[PDB]
C-alpha cells in the first residue's frame, strides 16, 4: 500500500539543471528519512542523497555533493532532487527510496519505478 | 566427569547445533554489504551494542573455559563435583560472533555512506556498560575474585540481549506489520535458544545437578529471552499483525 512515483527525468545538456520529483503514497515524507539512489548501465546502485526525518538535515555522496540538493515538500508529499551542474557521468536511473529500518533483522527498502536522466555532452 | 557417553554425545551435538543455527545468521548481512560496498540501512548502534554484548559473553566463556584459577573459584562457590557450565561451542560462538561483529564494523568504516553514524543514546550505553564493568574490575582485583567479575560480564550480556530483542519488537508494535520478517533467520534463532537450553538440561540430567543453571545464569536467560521473543515475533507475524 506504499507507492513511490518518480518524474522530472529526461535528456538535459551537460552543465544543465533538472529537478527530479518523487510522489509518495501510503506514508508521510516529513515523518521519514527519505533517500535518492541511482543505477547506471552496468554499474551497481549508488547511494546519492538523504534527508533527515523531523529536520532539514541533508547528506550527499561525494560524487554529487555541492551540485545536488534534496528538499521535501510536505505540502505536496513529495521529495525533490534539484540536480544542478549535471555532467554526462550522472547518466543513471534515479530511484527515490524510503526504508523501514530494523533493529536486528534486514531493513525493508521501498523503491520507485525509475526515471532515466540522460546527460548529453 | 561425564557419566553417560550417549548423553555426553547428545550434549556435544545439540551444543554444535546451537553454534550452527546462531553463528550462521551473521553471514547474510556481511554478504549483502560486500556485494553492495555500502552499509546504508544497517543500524550502526545495534552493531556497536552487539559487539559489547558479544565481548562480555566472550570474557565469561573464554575465562571460565581456559582459567584453572577461575575454575577453582567455580568449584569453591558452586561445588566440588560440579561440571563447568561452559562448552567448547559456547567459546567457539563467542569468538566467532566477536570476529563477525568486528568484520561488520570494518565494513561500516570501509563501505559506510549515507546519513548513518548513529552513536548518541547508544554510544552513551557503551560508556555506562564498560564503565560499570571497569568499576567492578577494580572491586574484584584486591582479592583476585575473578569468577564474580566474569559473572558481571554475563549479566551485562543478559542486559544487551534485552537491548537486542526489546527495541526490535517495540518497532513492530509502535508500527504495524512485521516488516523485515525473515522466517529462516527467526527459525534459526529459535533453534539456537532451544538447543542451548537443551544442552544445559542434558548436562543437568547427567551430573544430576541443576546448579549449572545458576553457575551460568547468563546462558540460561540468553536462551529463554531468545525463545520468548521469537515466539512473540511468530505471534506478531502469524496472528496479531498478518498483512
Ligand atoms: N544468538 C544470540 C544473538 S547473536 S545474532 C547477532 C546478529 N548481528 C543478528 O542478530 O543479526 C541471541 O541469543 O540473541
Numbering used by the authors:
A (entry chain C): 1 to 121
B (entry chain A): 3 to 245
Q: Could you pull the original sentences from the published paper?
A:
Cystinosin is a member of the PQ-loop family of solute carrier (SLC) transporters and uses the proton gradient to drive cystine export into the cytoplasm. Cystinosin is a proton coupled lysosomal cystine transporter, which functions as the primary route for the export of cystine out of the lysosome. The transporter comprises seven transmembrane helices (TMs) and uses the outwardly directed proton electrochemical gradient, generated by the V-ATPase, to drive cystine export from the lysosome in a 1:1 stoichiometry. To address these questions, we present the crystal structures of cystinosin from Arabidopsis thaliana in both apo and cystine bound states.
To understand the structural basis of the recognition and transport of cystine we employed our previous binder trap methodology to stabilise the ligand bound state for structure determination. The ligand bound conformation of cystinosin is very similar to the apo state, with an RMSD of 0.48 Å over 240 Cα atoms. Cystine adopts an extended conformation within the binding site and makes several notable interactions to conserved side chains. Our crystallisation trials were conducted at pH 6.5, favouring the zwitterionic form of cystine, which we modelled into the structure. Indeed, we observe a salt bridge interaction between one of the amino groups of cystine and Asp191 (TM6). A further hydrogen bond interaction is made to a conserved serine, Ser228 (TM7).
